From Swiss-Prot:
Residue ranges of domain WW in the record: 1-28
Superkingdom as given in the UniProt entry: Eukaryota
Portion of the full sequence shown: 433 to 460 of 1098
Induction of the gene: Up-regulated in brain tissue from patients with Huntington disease.
Protein task: Transcription factor that binds RNA polymerase II and inhibits the elongation of transcripts from target promoters. Regulates transcription elongation in a TATA box-dependent manner. Necessary for TAT-dependent activation of the human immunodeficiency virus type 1 (HIV-1) promoter.
Domain remarks in the Swiss-Prot or TrEMBL record: The FF domains bind the phosphorylated C-terminus of the largest subunit of RNA polymerase II, probably mediate interaction with HTATSF1 and preferentially bind peptides with the consensus sequence [DE](2-5)-[FWY]-[DE](2-5).
Expression across tissues: Detected in brain neurons.
Subunit-level organization: Binds formin. Interacts (via the second WW domain) with TREX1 (via proline-rich region). Binds RNA polymerase II, HD and SF1.
Name of the protein described by the UniProt record: Transcription elongation regulator 1
């Protein structure tokens, strides 16, 4: 629940977490 999926209308969601300061695209 700590990973935020950022829903951009660009047609992509990405799990951005400051824990890695990175947007994760891989499936956890």
């Amino acid at each position: 629940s700590e990973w935020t999926e950022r829903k951009t209308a660009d047609g992509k969601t990405y799990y951005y977490n400051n824990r890695t300061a990175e947007s994760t695209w891989e499936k956890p």
